[model samples]
Target: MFENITAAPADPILGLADLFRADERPGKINLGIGVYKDETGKTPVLTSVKKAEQYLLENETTKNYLGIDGIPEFGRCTQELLFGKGSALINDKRARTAQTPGGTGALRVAADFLAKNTSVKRVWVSNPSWPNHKSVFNSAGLEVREYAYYDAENHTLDFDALINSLNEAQAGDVVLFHGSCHNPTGIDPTLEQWQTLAQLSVEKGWLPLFDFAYQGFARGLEEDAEGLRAFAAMHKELIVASSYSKNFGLYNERVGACTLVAADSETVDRAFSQMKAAIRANYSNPPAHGASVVATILSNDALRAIWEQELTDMRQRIQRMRQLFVNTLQEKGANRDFSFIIKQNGMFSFSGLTKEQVLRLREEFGVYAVASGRVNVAGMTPDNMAPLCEAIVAVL
Candidate 1:
């Protein structure tokens, strides 16, 4: 049995990261992974998170497990943070939240629950969704399908095609949407478009699932969650997977929550019970340190304020990087109209570079980006902008 196992292919994102580390090139840039980095190319822990951890260290007494659902406050606070403080679903007790290892774990928990509990075993994701969406659902024995999403030719969202494809989904099937800051592509829908999609979700009777990985990274926390809030307003039933990796700068901590919105409290109660059972069968419970820190900050007025301001700064920095990248490209005489880079939101920009261009950029210029030409805007800085822009122009 041991001899029969073959070596697995390295993950695309992590593989690029590995190669970047191995290279000895000076001034090389790594823009492959979807991680938030500061101007000095560091993923700094938020001050709020540090303070919360210190509080936990001083006051907490035991390391006992948090059970299958994890800390109750973590569940409640995260749900409120994702939707809104005064969100109707939270106040009405129509939403149920369960802690998980991270956004990926939350998604897996939801997928496994749907696969095991519901008659629907299909999940429809955007055409160019996060790579793990398909893999995780497939692992849970659910059929993962794609609807039209990104229009690569024009570098924009294919909203009409997306609507048509989603309309074709069977009633009760799960339709996954990036709540904000679409990964890899960074293109999100307009509010009017979100309303149309919500209407379509109601009309088609599709179960909407919102994957919110980069909430604060796109804009303000509440502003970025507009799509999820829209869905919550229009539909009685929905699924949400949220992460603290980017917002709280807790990547290694792996904190997240999976929430279900049901039409009534009774339904939410039943769904949550089964969801807890699902968690028990799988990871059993989430880690306490990360979720506890999150709850501490969120429940405290001062710490919460600090986290929000830090998040705002990170968001603004990424926006500045987008502007700088575009300006540098044009100034360096690249004839390509790359204005879409600035318009795209969040940590990524689908730079419209072909695979050949991407390969050349890496091999000839020592700059690493995804084969899809997605550049992590957070990876760019004032120091590296000139060289990165010149390399991009050289490849073009």
Candidate 2:
């Protein structure tokens, strides 16, 4: 019965991890995955998360399931965190939240919902988006199109191109935006641009679907949420898919939430009920521990403070590492301007390396990066920067 099945190609980014694991090189660096590694070359558990886990150990009495929407507290906490407590959308009862497996899972749920319930013609993603973004939406059977986004020629946002594309999109189409910290090529729009986009959403009657995978990584939690906040403030309807993977270090835990914001409480109520039904028919609900810890940390003052501090430190460290990489290249007499790498926010830097250059870096130096010339700056450390820069310069 299974004879039709054949072996498939490995995940492009994660596949490097497997190969890097087996490599014997002492100075090998794996910059393919968008995971944040500390200055110590580790993904340490945040103190706030540890405290929440301990609290759950002593306080959690029931190991029961949380049903389709997951724990009430978890969902509510997500709503508050994403849009803020003072948000009119949150307070007006126009927003509904559902816990899912993770940010990807939240996106999946939202995609499936759009495919089934809405008459949305296609889902529009920014050009040069996360590699998996297109695949995930396509797998849900939605038409996918790329709007003008990153200017690969210059490593900047082509606001004119982006605006023109948005204006051209038809009504009943879904426009996906990186709420903060654009992946791979980390160029984000300005506040003025965001306001213009929000105005376009209203003018075009397009669904604003936000993929918020890296809140707190770009600047701070609140600062990173600026786009989402600004959009929510302006528009009466929006969709948000958020993750705890990067912020709370719950990558494997697969914890996240999808929020459906409507024009009014009554519409939100109906949408919320239907989404619960949809989740029940699928995965039933999300996991418990991750969401529980997330809630505990966000709700409690001391733990929340600690988590914010950790996030700030991590953001600053990544920025510093980006500087290290850029400075090293400049100091070594490389002609390329790596200043854009420093300007791009988040865990990634879409290094302007050609495919041949990338292949050479791996085959000759054991420095693995994605085929698209994208490298995770988070993977660069103090001890490894000198060699990594040398290899990059050598490859050039």
Candidate 3:
């Protein structure tokens, strides 16, 4: 049975990462993956995380297995992070969260819960979303549908088309929104647009699901969550899959959560039980260390302050690179405006470079980007900007 099994196709994003690693080009620049790189060209562990780990080293007494939902404090911290301290959602006991391996884990568990528990037959995502979105939902046996989001030609959000496409979503469907810093394309809805989406979900009777992996990456920490908070205010039932991998620089540690919000505390408990059942059947229990570190850092004022500042630094740097990439491209003689890049937020940008252009960029310039032109904005540095722009303009 094993002998005839065909090898699966390479993941579009991770495959590029593998090729980048295998290549031995002298000055190769990898913009293929979404990992954040600082000006020094290294992904540094946060000082706050280091401090928290030290504290955990001193006090943690257990090598014991965590509950299916992981640490109790973790759910609280995750909730406060999303809904702010003293949130009515938390006070009223309408929200429940489960720690997971990563945002992907949370998404898969959410997908499982939806597929197995709900009447939802379809999940709607943006047309050019992170390639994994389709695979994750589809793998769970839910039909993945597309909603018009970005206007590729103009490099902006096609709000009208977005509304038009989502209007087709049925009462039992799930519409997934990128809470902030949309992957592939960095364009995010304005607060007003998010409210419009929230209102639409209520009128259409579709349940709103949010993939909030890059909180504190688009803007400030609290500011980044406004979109999802808006949805929570309008809709009593919502699903959010969140990750600390990007914001907390806990990538390898795999910390994330799946939160379910329901109409009342009783309904929340029912949904929470289903979420735990989903996890019990999947990974059994989440890893402890990353969640522990996050809980430690967030609950302590000093550590939380340090973490906030460090996160600010990361966000500012990404924004700096975003602006620099656009400026450098223009200075290097690309006739296109490319100004939309500055308007976009987060680690990646849909550079609007075509597949042929992306190929030229890699083969001739040793600068790697995804075939669809999703370049990691955080990959650019002051030193690399000139050459990167040169290659981009040459390809253009």
lDDT of 3 by residue, 1-396 (tens): 899999999899888876779888887899878888989899999999999999989998878899999999999989988988878999999999999999999999999998988899899999889899999999999999999999989888999999889878889899999999998789899999988888888988988889999999987888999999988987999989999998899999999999999999999999889989999998889999999999999889999999999999999998898889888888999988889889899998888788999999899989999998999988899999999999999998
lDDT of 2 by residue, 55-83 (tens): 99999898888878887888888887788
Q: Give the alpha-carbon lDDT of every model.
A: 0.89, 0.87, 0.91
lDDT of 2 at 303: 91
In model 3, the clashing pairs are none
Please give the clash total of every predicted structure, in order.
0, 1, 0
Weakest lDDT window of 10 consecutive positions for candidate 2: 9-18
Candidate RMSDs in order: 1.1, 1.3, 1.0
| Better TM-score candidate (1, 2) | 1
RMSD in Å for candidate 3, one decimal? 1.0
| Candidate that scores best on lDDT | 3
Candidate 1 at 218: error in angstroms?
2.2
Query: Model 1, range 166-285, lDDT digits (tens) per residue?
Result: 767989899999999998788999888998889988988999889999987776788888888988998999999999998888998989999999998999999899999899999878
Count steric clashes of candidate 2.
Answer: 1
Report the CA-based lDDT of candidate 3 relative to the real structure.
0.91
* Poorest 10 consecutive residues by lDDT, candidate 3: 17-26
